[PDB]
Paper text:
The proline catabolic pathway consisting of proline dehydrogenase (PRODH) and L-glutamate-γ-semialdehyde (GSAL) dehydrogenase (GSALDH) catalyzes the four-electron oxidation of L-proline to L-glutamate. PRODH is a flavoenzyme that catalyzes the FAD-dependent oxidation of L-proline to Δ1-pyrroline-5-carboxylate (P5C). Also known as ALDH4A1, GSALDH is a member of the aldehyde dehydrogenase (ALDH) superfamily and catalyzes the NAD+-dependent oxidation of GSAL to L-glutamate. In contrast, in some bacteria, most notably Gram-negative bacteria, the PRODH and GSALDH genes are combined into the putA gene, which encodes a bifunctional enzyme, proline utilization A (PutA).
Fragments 7 and 13 were bound to the GSAL substrate-binding site of the GSALDH active site. The refined occupancies of 7 were 0.83 and 0.86 in chains A and B of the asymmetric unit, respectively. Fragments 7 and 13 engaged well-known recognition elements of ALDH superfamily enzyme active sites. The carboxylates formed hydrogen bonds with the backbone of the anchor loop (1000s loop in SmPutA). The carboxylates also formed an ion pair with Arg843 and a hydrogen bond with Ser845. The heterocycles were flanked by two Phe side chains, which formed the so-called aromatic box of ALDH active sites. The dioxane ring of 7 forms a hydrogen bond with Arg843. The cyclic structures of 7 and 13 were perpendicular to the side chain of the glutamate product and, thus, could not access the oxyanion hole. The most notable inhibition occurred with 7 and 13, whose poses and interactions mimicked the substrate GSAL. The data were fitted to a global competitive inhibition model, resulting in Ki values of 0.32 mM ± 0.02 mM for 7 and 1.5 mM ± 0.1 mM for 13.
Residue numbers in the entry:
A (entry chain A): 14 to 79, 82 to 134, 137 to 1233
B (entry chain B): 1020 to 1126
C (entry chain B): 644 to 697
């Protein structure tokens, strides 16, 4: 049996001093990075004046000779939307391959009338790209109805001539401007003109981010065929005068990541070597493009092996990009220069600023890391670039510097830095095809600066170029970009020739972070401190984590019944690692039923003392516990990994979530709780095994901070991390009498639920067990004679809808993560993928290919993607479902499991193709994705089908089209919506989490209504209000006044104002995402009145919160609602058979205590969802305007929209 | 239509143009239910006309118009109310219903 | 353009024929100018060969 974590994440090679200096700089504070760069980039006053003069000369030439689209817009008086729509139409017409066919369609069908009739795929799928071309502004999603209107308008106004001009424009742009050519042969033909003028070329075959083995093989053969064509054309010109190729390592392997480093070195490296061997034979350059920051150091391991490989000796064409916007850049250069010296290879080093800036900001914020791996002020990148050029120019004997930039100021600075001595081969400049030629035609040639320029030349079809064209446009198109500024008439040449080195040198704090970019720790500002994660791409972090994880496996973890009086005796058994039952993680002593009942009585005795701790001090306990969990995170990770079968990545996020719960509920307490918000009393917190620290901590922390003593009943499968959480909370100051841990099975849970002093239950788990708890609680009333509150957060049958406008590679990554992360053992996991028919086969092929790249095994290795399921019984249940589907003839795709999985309980990630959504009839809590296909016109019916399961937890939509977003999000009934991203990993206070129907009672965990459920009088949550008044409520209040029910009419109007229906907030979170929180109607509320006035109050409460009602016909109160306004009557039904008229979304009950108890039992017996029931006596309705609390009559909806999905962040284009 | 607004000129020609900015991403939900009902009946041409009406309807348009500082000048498209339908044929009635429902109206 | 240039004379007629104050008459002529320019622009944005007159 392999020792735990003995092979967690060993580096590819021992880290040299130079490699360690790189890692040390990964997230170095910006104020520490800049001073040495300022010093390295400093030049004499004479040189700075000469450079400013050169830059001015270049900029004057640029502005003196200065679009095709702009002239088209002008000629036909197009609006911006018409220009975009026209280019989308032109793009579509160019998907028609035959020219004569296209021209006939234009003349005879498009121009004369309905373009829609002739052109499964929206015309406007790529309109975000064309929007950038036409307007310079990025929008993440497409207003396809505005574009359709604009296209109809422009065609009806201008006819065939404008279509012809648009087609010719788009043909030129996509065939000659965004690419040098559609194929490498075409690109080579078009390169001769500028090669004769002294330019050179590096061809970019536009591949990246392979999703499957087949994709990677396709990109490989594309590079190989390109190298032959380029090498044939080079014809012995060599690596400096002749053309070369650029490759992206992410194109050549579907799992190019540090976590998969062994596969990268074993499988990706030989492919690069084979391409490099061919480049060597033709003697052309082969450049490795730089990608995301978490791939930098991994790529150095490939560069090292290749440069030391004797089979490649004799060739100096290997090239490597370094990104000056990265904090490691100078240290990477030191490493590369030294590698060039050791290997004797003159490495071609392309210095760039960097293409992934927005994405790096978003990633570091999402991951809660210490700092960014890139600068946050554009001027810092400029100084970094110049400083790194100084380093490169001192080493031209051993490397070949290649200064890629379109910035005339940067260029001029380096031109003068390099000095007067030049020869071809010493260094070169580089630029992008169709972007940098205006500048570099002022540089290349004896009549200019007589310095060479290599043109980075994209090569590819329309489909290939459009895929990531947005990122490429933002490089030179953001407000801080030189190319954007040179075109801005409000930017002077003196501004453009400003010396970034001297500007930074003179700032008050050299290297200060951008004011408008939050460090990840500060995402929530003054509200609370964000939890911190760990960078599993950082070798220092991996090495320290390895030791902490090993040490955690040496610990004698135990879980005991921790009563107020001390630990109790009980039946003791071992806890085994679900991924390897030979690995004993610890021992649990389980609680007797007698001791569980004793614990409730002790909690009841202690309830006054804990309620008397002021809310601010209770919140301080939670904040202290959060600090303790943050400090203990590495040890907690190890326990979660081994006890719960989680990967390190998922364990980090789990501990972060627990920290966030603690800090969120602490802050919410400080915002709300006062003396009148009295605690319920002892609360039983029952938690699941799949989030054994986070949900455990969340429920307990909320109940405790609301002033309630807690009986914590963790899942029988995962008691050890629960015991450690309780230990931490007690260390943080929670008294033993306020937090008792009762390990054991459902018998312990049930004994707690049934105990007379139990004042509330927080349950997260299966819908079936929640229903059993609901039935037990319906037997009971509080001492005041009211229902015992139950928060029951249960399963989902979560769907994602994907239309033909979505990017398949994005979809597949989000599906693989959503469905199979944590072996599908998230309540949020994707269960049903719905693919529009026209793209379903392509996406399914990619999905199956991606499925087979997953590594399944014991989770104490970083390379493991999917761990075990929690128990053999879970495994058996999931497998029975798979075999039932297989026996029905459904196509089943499964990854093959390694033999080592036999010592644990594993289910292979599985894809099952269903005919109809109704083929799936129960939540299958495992790594099992079901796929259905739908016709575009059946989208609305499909949303009906998703809603028809009765669940309503998470839901995903992948589309670029605003009409589809509006339609689907308005019709879907789920608590957590996700647009153009995965559907898992809800973040406390950012995506408040929880659903409706069979998925939950609410209120949402990690949301602002949660604590109010845990006190007898709910406070007003922060930001909880709405200026909107339900119009049916208003009609009802007028009807009441017309009937003479003046007091009830006033109460109705007050309910209308008090309701927060219509609340619509954006919650603070990471850049590149919009996180929305809205309050909607719940649905149909069951009203069980006893008196006419009670009915009117119930109806006012329900209508004010947007609901319809079903009124108990057995109340005999039909004559009290005569002659209702039609608007109110539409919302009112009478029910004699409550079970037949559901599902309801809540209930309001009026009666004395025994009437309430009887009704509560009848409601618990209704099939389907657990209903949030509020009861009041007639006297309570008369005395208390809040007898029914409106918090529980609205439904919370969270929506998280990935606004970077189009390829960039529009808001951050204004941040420089 | 309103004088000094973008629908006005379209009343004065025999085929109305699409006015500037005249579109909406919202689809009437009753229109959607009607289209599905037509689908179930096999009324394929009418269901298509209904979906097309749902899309081309500008019900829900909500614009801020350029004007002086210190003022917000808003322009919005709502349902008209209840539309009188005088059909002759079943298909005509379905098309009339589609048009009226797509624009948020009762009939 | 003609109504703008001739606004003072138009004001005099509107004041005396229609009982308007000078301020109201200015706004009246402005509104006429704006109708002209607005419908001119709306036409340039929309009308093509298929939008036949009544
Ligand atoms: C031929 C060529 C090849 C290239 N290959 C690659 C590659 O393989 N990998 C790669 O990542 N990039 C690559 N780039 C660079 C990238 O695509 C952009 O073109 C480049 O960063 C633009 O910088 P600049 O000197 O042209 O223009 P500038 O306007 O001078 O610089 C713009 C750059 O500043 C940086 N920046 C913008 N805002 C901020 C901010 N708030 N804080 C910090 N920095 C900021 C960004 O890097 C941005 O791209 C290449 C560029 C060229 C010309
Ligand atoms: N909506 C959410 O936030 C959310 C979050 C996580 C998990 N879940 C759901 O949790 C389920 C998986 O977790 P699980 O397997 O631990 O669920 P579960 O219903 O099996 O177990 C949850 C808890 O209920 C307890 N329990 C079992 N029988 C009981 C009884 N008769 N009386 C009182 N308590 C009893 C268990 O001991 C455990 O602590 C899934 O269905 C998942 O969707 C929902
Ligand atoms: O996967 C989720 O969306 C999710 C939902 C609730 C709580 C969590 C979750 O994942 C992170 C840990 O705690
Ligand atoms: Mg269970």
């Amino acid at each position: 049996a392999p020792a735990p974590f003995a092979d967690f994440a060993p580096p590819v090679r021992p880290q040299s001093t130079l490699r360690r200096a790189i890692t040390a700089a990964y997230r170095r504070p910006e104020t520490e990075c800049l001073p040495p760069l300022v010093e390295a980039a400093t030049q004499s006053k004479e040189i700075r004046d000469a450079a400013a003069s050169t830059a001015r000369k270049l900029i004057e030439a640029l502005r003196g000779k200065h679009s095709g689209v702009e002239g088209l817009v002008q000629e036909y008086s197009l609006s911006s939307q018409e220009g975009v729509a026209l280019m989308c139409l032109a793009e579509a017409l160019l998907r028609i391959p035959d020219t004569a066919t296209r021209d006939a369609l234009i003349r005879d069908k498009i121009a004369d009338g309905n373009w829609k009739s002739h052109l499964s795929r929206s015309l406007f799928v790529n309109a975000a790209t064309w929007g950038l071309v036409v307007t310079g502004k990025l929008t993440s999603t497409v207003n396809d109805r505005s574009l359709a209107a604009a296209l109809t308008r422009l065609i009806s106004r201008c006819g065939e001539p404008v279509i012809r001009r648009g087609v010719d424009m788009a043909m030129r742009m996509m065939g000659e401007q965004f690419v040098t050519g559609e194929t490498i042969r075409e690109a080579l033909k078009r390169s001769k003109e500028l090669e004769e003028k002294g330019f050179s070329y590096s061809y970019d075959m536009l591949g990246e981010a392979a999703t499957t083995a087949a994709d990677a093989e396709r990109y490989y053969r594309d590079y190989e065929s390109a190298i032959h064509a380029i090498g044939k054309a080079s014809a012995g010109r060599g690596i400096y005068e002749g053309p070369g190729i650029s490759i992206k390592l992410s194109a050549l392997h579907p799992r190019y990541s540090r976590a998969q480093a062994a596969r990268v070195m074993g499988e990706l490296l030989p492919r690069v070597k084979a391409l490099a061997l061919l480049a060597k034979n033709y003697d052309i350059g082969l450049n490795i493009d730089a990608e995301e920051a978490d791939r930098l150091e991994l790529s150095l391991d490939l560069l090292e092996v290749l440069c030391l490989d004797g089979d490649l000796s004799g060739w100096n064409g290997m090239g490597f990009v370094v990104q000056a916007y990265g904090k490691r850049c100078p240290f990477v250069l030191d490493f590369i220069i030294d590698l060039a010296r050791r290997s004797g290879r003159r490495i071609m080093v392309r210095l760039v600023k960097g293409a992934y800036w927005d994405a790096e900001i978003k990633r570091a914020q999402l991951d809660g890391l210490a700092d960014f791996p890139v600068f946050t002020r554009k001027i810092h990148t400029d100084v970094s670039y110049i400083a790194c050029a100084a380093k490169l120019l001192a080493a031209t004997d051993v490397v070949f510097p290649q200064f890629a930039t379109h910035n005339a100021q940067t260029l001029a600075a380096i031109y003068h830095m390099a000095g007067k001595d030049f020869h071809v081969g010493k260094y070169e400049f580089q630029c992008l095809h169709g972007m940098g030629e205006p500048l570099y035609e002022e540089v290349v040639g004896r009549g200019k600066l007589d310095r060479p320029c290599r043109i980075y030349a994209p090569v590819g079809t329309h489909e290939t170029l459009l895929a990531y064209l947005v990122r490429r446009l933002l490089e030179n198109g953001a407000n801080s970009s030189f190319v954007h500024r040179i075109n801005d008439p409000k930017v002077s040449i003196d501004e453009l020739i400003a010396d970034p080195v001297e500007v930074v040198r003179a700032m008050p704090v050299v290297g200060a972070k951008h004011d408008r970019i939050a460090l990840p720790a500060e995402l929530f500002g003054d509200a609370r401190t964000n939890s911190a994660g760990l960078d599993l791409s950082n070798e220092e972090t991996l090495a320290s984590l390895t030791e902490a994880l090993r040490e955690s496996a040496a610990m004698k973890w135990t879980a005991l019944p921790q009563l107020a009086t001390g630990p109790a005796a009980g039946e003791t058994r071992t806890v085994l690692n679900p991924g390897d039952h030979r690995d004993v993680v610890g021992s649990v002593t389980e609680t007797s039923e007698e001791d569980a009942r004793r614990a409730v009585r002790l909690a009841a005795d202690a309830a006054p003392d804990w309620a008397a701790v002021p809310p601010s001090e209770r919140a301080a306990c939670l904040d202290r516990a959060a600090e303790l969990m943050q400090a203990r995170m590495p040890t907690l990770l190890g326990l979660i990994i081994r006890e719960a079968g989680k990967s390190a990545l998922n364990a980090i996020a789990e501990v972060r979530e627990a920290i966030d719960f603690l800090r969120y509920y602490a802050e919410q307490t400080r915002r709300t709780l006062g003396p009148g918000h009295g605690p319920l009393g002892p609360i039983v917190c029952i938690s699941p095994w799949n989030f054994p620290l986070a949900i455990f901590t969340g429920q307990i922390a909320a109940a405790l901070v609301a002033g309630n003593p807690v009986l914590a009943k963790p899942a029988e499968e995962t008691p050890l991390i629960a015991a450690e959480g309780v230990r931490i909370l007690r260390e943080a100051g929670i008294p033993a009498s306020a937090l008792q841990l009762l390990p054991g099975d459902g018998r312990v849970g049930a004994a707690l639920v049934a105990a007379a002093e139990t004042a509330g239950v927080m349950f997260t788990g299966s819908t079936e067990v929640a229903r059993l708890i609901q039935a037990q609680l319906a037997d009971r009333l509080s001492p005041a004679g009211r229902p015992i509150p139950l928060i029951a957060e249960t399963g989902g049958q979560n769907a994602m809808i994907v239309d033909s406008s979505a990017l398949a590679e994005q979809v597949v990554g989000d599906v693989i993560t959503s469905a199979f992360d944590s072996a599908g053992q998230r309540c949020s996991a994707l269960r049903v993928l719905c693919l529009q028919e026209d793209v379903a086969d392509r996406i399914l092929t990619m999905l199956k290919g991606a499925l087979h790249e997953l590594h399944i095994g014991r989770t104490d290795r970083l390379s493991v993607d999917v761990g075990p399921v929690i128990t053999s019984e879970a495994k058996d249940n999931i497998e029975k479902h798979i075999e039932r589907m297989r026996g029905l003839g459904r196509k089943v795709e499964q990854i093959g499991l390694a033999s080592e999985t036999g010592v644990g309980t594993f289910v292979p990630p599985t894809i099952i193709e269903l005919e109809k959504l109704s083929d799936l009839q129960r939540e299958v809590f495992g790594p099992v994705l079901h796929v259905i296909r739908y016709r575009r016109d059946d989208l609305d019916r499909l949303v009906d089908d998703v809603n028809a399961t009765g669940y309503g937890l998470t839901f995903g939509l992948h589309t670029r089209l605003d009409e589809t977003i509006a339609h689907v999000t308005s019709r879907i009934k789920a608590g957590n919506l996700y647009i153009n991203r995965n559907i898992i990993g809800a973040v406390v206070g950012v995506q408040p989490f929880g659903g409706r129907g069979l998925s939950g009672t609410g209120p949402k965990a990690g949301g602002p209504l949660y604590l109010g459920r845990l006190v007898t009088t709910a406070p007003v949550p922060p930001q909880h209000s709405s200026v909107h008044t339900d119009p049916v409520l208003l009609d009802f209040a007028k009807w009441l006044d017309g009937k003479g029910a003046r007091a009830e009419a006033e109460a109705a109007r007050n309910a209308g104002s008090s309701s927060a229906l219509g609340l619509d907030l954006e919650l603070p979170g990471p850049v590149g995402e919009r996180n929305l929180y809205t309050l909607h109607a719940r649905g149909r509320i069951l009203l069980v009145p006893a008196t006419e006035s009670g009915l009117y109050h119930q109806l006012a409460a329900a209508l004010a919160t947007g609901n319809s009602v079903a009124i108990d016909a057995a109340s005999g109160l039909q004559a009290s609602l005569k002659n209702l306004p039609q608007t109110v009557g539409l919302r009112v039904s009478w029910s004699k058979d409550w079970a037949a008229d559901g599902p309801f979304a809540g209930a309001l009950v009026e009666g004395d205590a025994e009437r309430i108890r009887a009704v509560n039992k009848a409601i618990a017996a209704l099939p389907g969802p657990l209903l949030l029931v509020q009861a009041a006596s007639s006297g309570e309705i008369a005395r208390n305007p809040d007898a029914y609390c409106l918090n529980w009559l609205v439904e919370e909806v969270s929506a998280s929209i990935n606004t970077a999905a189009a390829g960039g962040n529009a808001s951050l284009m204004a941040i420089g």
